[PDB]
């Protein structure tokens with residue numbers, strides 16, 4: 001497909017699948033802080049899947065690369081705060097990241113192909 005706009009609904013559907021994954025439970029809403037009062041002493045830019053979905057629906061992503069950067073930020077934040085590899089949260093982040101990356105690859109490739117087609121002549 002050379003549809004330049006198709007990534008948005010593809011990302012909406014992928015976020016729906018991520019919300020149905022039990023493994024997204026730790027990452028659905030902005031970090032509390034009452035449970036992690038030193039979170040901002042480690043994490044510069046909090047990110048969660050609800051914030052990514054609201055940013056998409058507001059029309060405040062221009063490309064799927066920008067959405068992908070924020071989703072990758074969720075997993076880097078979780079790694080930056082994980083006190084060890086043998087943490088349930090860390091194992092949840094790795095599985096959900098693998099699922100995300102498996103599904104976002106086509107969405108990025110199709111978008112970049114469509115833009116190249118748009119500027120072909």
Ligand SMILES: CC1(C)CO[C@@H](CNC(=O)N2CCN(C(=O)c3cccc(O)c3)CC2)CO1
Nearest residue numbers: 026027029030031032035047048077078081089
């Ligand atoms: C001592 C405690 C209270 C520690 O917390 C429980 C296990 N969970 C974590 O350690 N997390 C830190 C890592 N996370 C995040 O960076 C994150 C990312 C996006 C949104 C979001 O809301 C958090 C998730 C939660 C177990 O008991």
